[PDB]
Write a protein that binds this ligand. Structure first.
Ligand SMILES: NC(=S)c1ccc[n+]([C@@H]2O[C@H](COP(=O)([O-])OP(=O)(O)OC[C@H]3O[C@@H](n4cnc5c(N)ncnc54)[C@H](OP(=O)(O)O)[C@@H]3O)[C@@H](O)[C@H]2O)c1
Lengths: 498, 498, 498, 498
């Protein structure tokens, strides 16, 4: 029997595993060490969670290695691997309300949104990649023939082997799902390290892999610290690939660690300062709706959030007025209240960073139009914030807040290349967007934006089939889409002479 | 007008540039610093070559950046970029005897081989990749529609931008060509750093780009040290990708440096300890010829050389006997002499390693059947070497020689999995091969070998259309084939709502 | 409420719909016309089935047209189309025993084979193609730019529209599934004409599309004659594509009718005279098992059955003795009995073709080693038959039996090119096979065989991911694999200037 | 030595072969029969050309079959086949002025346009497809494994064999090039039948294949009639594929003949009635320029010409005024004169049809704004024509003119779906276009148009990399792009068990 933290909430009885998941079983960490996970709605302790030690990382990797090399996962047909991943998606769907509730509790995700996105997209991710398993194909290649003999050259796509994945805290289940689905679809086994502050949906997911009949050791989950657990994963001689999403400084470190151990493969998604360019010829009311969403979606805790809005001179003031009108209509509160628009920030230290980010924005001369502070109420709520008169040299024009902070600059009527230059003048390159009714501007601007994703007349429109990843210091490699699979496969060339 | 080192040799008048190649012109390094390049046939100085400094790297990168951002290369059609690369191949073909002679002098490449392979394959490489330019395609993807609206999602394959490539000394022109052809075909610009010991064909190639009409700054070439020039390339904030081929330890350092600067993309080809498994049921005479080739081709200075031969017990002794017969027929001599089939080693420091390598081989208990020593003559010739009775724990069973040293172990008749385990018991995974007439054994062995390339009843059969790269500590990423383009492209996702 | 023919058989209750399926309802044909479907195990009438008339074809096409143009199927996400098809596969699985029992009744399919193949593969087919829906992708193409302007060229993959599929009787559910899964996955709607003699699993399948929630009109099924129903489908101005499997002569007529109406697209799978070449160096026992399978699988009513076996001189007599010994072991009888491994032929007229076929073989001088006659029991059982001394000019060397008749010729030891010539001396080119342990012979033979499928050391190894179709007079176009989708899609090129 | 018709024009000495091209040699037809090719600039006879007979077709096919089966073309590397095609493109470029001049004489192509398009694009076509040769790749497919055994499944892309291509007269060299380049790049051999009225660039092209070193029998060219030569190609038992561009009725007949002989593969490009929708929010002057090019380009003898322009009510009159202004400026004249904008129609019979066409347009009640008549000068010149007040029921709203006749209908302001319906009402679906600055309309309209090509804010922008082909009664199959290759290849599936 699995030990649960039990909690009657949201019309449900949540049953929440809290231990490490190694070789298909939930087990205490070395020395039964634990830590507290904190509810951001009221600052309370949800429960104690096992705190993985180095010896636990080694056990997880050994279980993953054994599962890949000798266990069933390495022997079944691609098609049957596919069936298991579909079945996993089904099981996640059967538990979707419970998962969304756990996410509401652990990450402060608004319940209605956690259902549709955090959980709904996770389900879609597994179903999408499940369909790839038997459609991953190599090549036959018309090489020059060693006359009078003949040659056949083919490629085989093969799994990389044991993978480590390090997840951030903003969408705990969904980031896990993005990377894990592609990893498992390609035939690998995995050790997953969730963000220390958000372990609960990952551990509930682990239990769901058991219900789905995923062979023991294919998935291992180790709550605990990046600098202990994540570090050992990057150093481990039996791990052949790291998939990472998080900050630029940690991504750099992780890549360095992959280098110094055994040149394991690495993919990096490192956040952004993504620009949204709104032209005077756009649909204005839509621009306001999508611009708001571009910033405030999931309380700003969103890798692709627009970190700067460039609004054409002649519509700037009307744009700002409408935004203020819309912001005042936002309902802030408990993520379980069904009319909540804006939930709390993920954890305390992030709230403090947002407070300091906004103090700095004011200090350096930007105009604070709304917000900029903690909402007085228990937990870690931050006021939806609007800054105008933001200039290109300012800190808040360069640094990613990862909070609900709209950062607006004007640009000159009928200038296009000039605004592009300012939009591209970051070392980040994750996402971007443009609002305009003009086909020629939209196409030209999408060509010129230096960003892995460009939205046109929409924002936050990700899709499990559409590859997502950064340029420049936003990193490299894709999650989602066919392209994600290539991070998790190797190519063997086989050349016959006959 | 360009300065040349002129040399009458091989019935040609060689005209060899010796300066840095920057922004379309040959220029002295900072402070007019130079170094000597050594002819390995006799130890003489061929000539003095500019020695690039930090400020020269910055200049090369600035030229590459300008050529990409504002120059013609970034504006022309993919089709026309292709035409220029074809033309470049034609120019190399027109200079094929001269390039082969420079490679003979600089790297000790046997002229007839240099013409067919070092140079001939280089020409094939530029022609092959020229064909890809207008055939690099993104996708349109059927994402979920935001009803009542519609969505269009497409991807664009874009160049990565400024690339640095760092080349080894074993096939100077060919390794340059492999990486440069893919890089340029993808629309990038490049700073190339040849091995310090082998700058000459690179510099001649630089001249050839001028003849072909490649726009100034697209190709920049910097003879000099890896610890100075290579390091700066890996550190440079405007370089977006490093392509590297060389030792595992330098590979690790480069990847580390890519991480710590601007998370530039990196590909690594890092050498190997590649097993060749020879079963009793093979064509024995062919196994001898191809076994010979697998070790001795290009005086063993060959990324994919078989570093271990495993020979089935019942044919082992007869295989060794026949190898000794063939080794005795090898004509050692000046690479310019027509009947030479074993040239000198590339440079002195490499000769020293080979001597030490075989001393250690004898020390640890292997049977030295022939060779092991520097040939008594001027230059840096090394006697074709055969070791038998090699055991798995031995240094020479583990470490890559990169020299003409056949390293032979027995395996028991009828064993298949046991020899596979032994063949896979390395941290390398670059290449491998199997000789057998049994279809079932050949297919099974090719599945089980943990290597990026598996040869079946042949060896050294590379092709410009067939991707080449390693697993495990042999690195990641491919040169050659369609797959190579992916290291030099990025994918932008563009999502419309309408 | 649907009308059923109900029958207690095989430990279950069959509930068989027997009417036309049009616009999501079961309906009588015009004038309530019917015909009898015959159980080949005892010659009895299973039930009466509606006999579609021209006005029923027009009704079915109109419903398909309306479902495509205005109904939900043409509006839902590709992903959701995929979900519906994966649900259809699930419902088929929930009815697997029932479907397999109907197939045993209607087509004489041995129940254990029908479960695993007729039905099992049909389920795989729908799951396979379900996974393609949101992975069908067009391209973005790097065209020459109309300077000083820019161009973007993309392709969209779109459905062709209303399709007609005409199905043979040998694998009623499976042929229906192969073609229908690919058709529906591509977003099309369809009118299916099962072979008149085998309508029952098609009509049960039709009911299953209702349980799966496939929108009305997407699937329409018309039991009836080819010369009436098939013809009108080929002629109809609103049908855009015909998918056909059947005889060469009907294929020709269908293609002609496609031409003369509205140049509707057409695919053709037209049977064959498939050669299996068995070399002396093969595993002989395995060659007997697979050789027997190549002929006798599904009582020889098998598109890809080996129609000639060429056996190397030195093993010929021993191959024949072993075949004779295994044939004696076959249990002929009721397809519903667990012991049976050879069921009756599909229908009476085909039984009489086989009797005549074997008479002609004897008359023209072939040696009848065993079989040749109807088995003396109720129904339409034919004896497993072996002919030897078959010469290239013989009728039975050229004509497709489509029955359990092994047709053996010798070839001289060491012949390879000579046997290949004889094996290719047909206007057919559907399948082929070779048994040999020799890698070089296997690869060479597979290159040289002029057939859409080459089996090596196996036979009948189809798979839902591996495309299947003929060369020459065996037709063109593929079923199964990614390639099948291409028959059911059109490519729209979109070129912007901006 | 080849017989020529020598002619001094355009400051060149033309050397024009005029005989059948069979098996690498120019030969007279059976009975030395000939016919006259007519210069459309003055009605004169250019020269006599051999008139191929049935026995000549058989000789050509026999030569093509021998070249494919036993000749060098079937034996060389894919890479070297490519080299020959790239050399063929070079030879064409060396002869470009001559080829453009022959085309000017034979087809009335304006010389400056023939250089850039008829000839320029032909050269691009051969170069583009030359690059595909060693990049045509099959697959390796992860099929279900016959446990405890293993399976490997791969596909080989193979040539179809002997092909016949049948070309129209509007772009004699370019149409020949589109189809022949893809056909030969795929490894096939070919028998080409140019339109009887335009044999001369085809015959000169034949001579160029000799200068390029294309092996004998690979290309065979048969000037003569469709009903004799084209018919025998469709019926021939050794021909495995027909590529056809022309009228719908001949297309139907061709497909019927493919069916009744040997179910040879067929592709069909059958012309169109392509709509161009011009919205009020477009760039009006650009719409006029592109609108005119959409009709008048190559004197309207253009497969993808806009056959109807729908112009939004509020800009209709101004659009017509501006078109009239621009039409008055077009310079009609000898195609060899540098100032000529508008050359003669291709041949007399076509001129007569255009005259009759416009008589009928006036009769049925459309407003003739200009032209409609043969130009009063020698040869077969037709005045650029503009019709307004065209109604959907009119003959000229339905029938393809294939001449320089702009056919304008109005549509109500704001009426998107209504105009789409009218634009789609036709049984053709070759091309279409839309001019609008509005991104949402542009994307919506392109989804809704039922045509193989949709131009957005441009027209006639074809590219050798962008596939081109029709929907509905405009046929199926693509010329150009990667997709064109699939018409000329077959897929062989090879499945091993081991
Ligand atoms: N299988 C392949 S492809 C291969 C190829 C070469 C060598 N090896 C292995 O390595 C051994 C020889 O070692 P080696 O010294 O000749 O090869 P490496 O040192 O790995 O040299 C490869 C390239 O990297 C450069 N480099 C060195 N330090 C660098 C740094 N900090 N940053 C950037 N670039 C740097 C080198 O420059 P310098 O010119 O200053 O050295 C050279 O151009 C061989 O015996 C063999 O075992 C393998």
């Amino acid at each position: 029997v699995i030990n649960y933290v039990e909690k009657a909430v949201n019309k449900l009885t949540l049953q929440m595993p809290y231990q490490l998941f190694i070789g298909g079983e939930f087990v205490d960490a070395e020395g039964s060490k634990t830590y507290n996970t904190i509810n951001p709605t009221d600052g309370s302790v949800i429960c104690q969670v096992s705190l993985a030690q180095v010896s636990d990382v080694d056990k997880a990797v050994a279980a993953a290695k054994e599962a890949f090399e000798n266990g069933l996962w390495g022997k079944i047909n691609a098609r049957d691997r596919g069936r298991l991943l579909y079945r996993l998606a089904d099981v996640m769907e059967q538990h979707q309300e419970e998962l969304a509730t756990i996410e509401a509790l652990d990450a402060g995700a608004v319940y209605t949104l956690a259902l549709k996105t955090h959980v709904g997209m996770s389900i879609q991710t597994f179903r999408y990649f499940a369909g790839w398993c038997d459609k991953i194909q190599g090549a036959t290649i018309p090489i020059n023939q060693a006359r009078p003999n003949r040659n056949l050259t083919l490629t085989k796509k093969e799994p990389v082997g044991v993978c480590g994945i390090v997840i951030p805290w903003n969408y705990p289940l969904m980031m896990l799902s993005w990377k894990t689905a592609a990893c498992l679809a390609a035939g690998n086994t995995v050790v997953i390290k969730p963000a220390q502050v958000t372990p609960l949906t990952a551990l509930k997911f682990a239990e769901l892999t058991l219900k789905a009949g995923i062979p023991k050791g294919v998935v291992n989950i180790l709550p605990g610290s990046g600098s202990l657990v994540g570090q050992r994963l990057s150093d481990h001689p039996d791990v052949r690939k790291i998939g990472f999403t998080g900050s630029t400084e940690v991504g750099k470190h992780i890549m360095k660690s992959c280098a110094l151990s055994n040149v394991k493969k690495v993919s990096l998604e490192l956040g952004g300062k993504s620009p949204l360019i709104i032209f005077a010829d756009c649909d204005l009311n839509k621009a306001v709706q999508m611009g708001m969403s571009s910033v405030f979606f999931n309380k700003g805790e969103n890798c692709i959030a627009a970190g700067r809005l460039f609004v054409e001179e002649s519509i700037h003031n009307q744009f700002v007025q409408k935004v203020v009108e819309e912001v005042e209509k936002m309902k802030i509160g408990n993520p379980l209240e069904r009319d909540t628009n804006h939930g709390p920030q993920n954890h305390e230290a992030h709230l403090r960073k947002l407070v300091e980010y906004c103090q700095r924005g004011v200090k350096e001369g930007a105009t604070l139009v709304c917000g900029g502070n903690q909402v007085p109420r228990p937990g870690f709520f931050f006021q939806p914030t609007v800054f105008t008169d933001v200039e290109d040299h300012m800190y808040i024009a360069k640094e990613e807040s990862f909070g609900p902070i709209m950062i607006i600059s004007r640009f000159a009527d009928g200038d296009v290349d000039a605004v592009l230059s300012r939009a591209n003048a970051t070392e980040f390159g994750l996402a971007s967007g443009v609002f305009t009714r003009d086909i020629n501007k939209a196409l030209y601007v999408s060509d010129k934006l230096q960003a892995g994703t460009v939205f046109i007349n929409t924002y936050n429109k990700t899709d499990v089939a559409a590859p997502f990843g950064g340029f420049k210091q936003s990193g490299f490699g894709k999650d989602l889409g066919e392209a994600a699979l290539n991070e998790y496969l190797r190519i063997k060339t086989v050349t016959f002479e006959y």
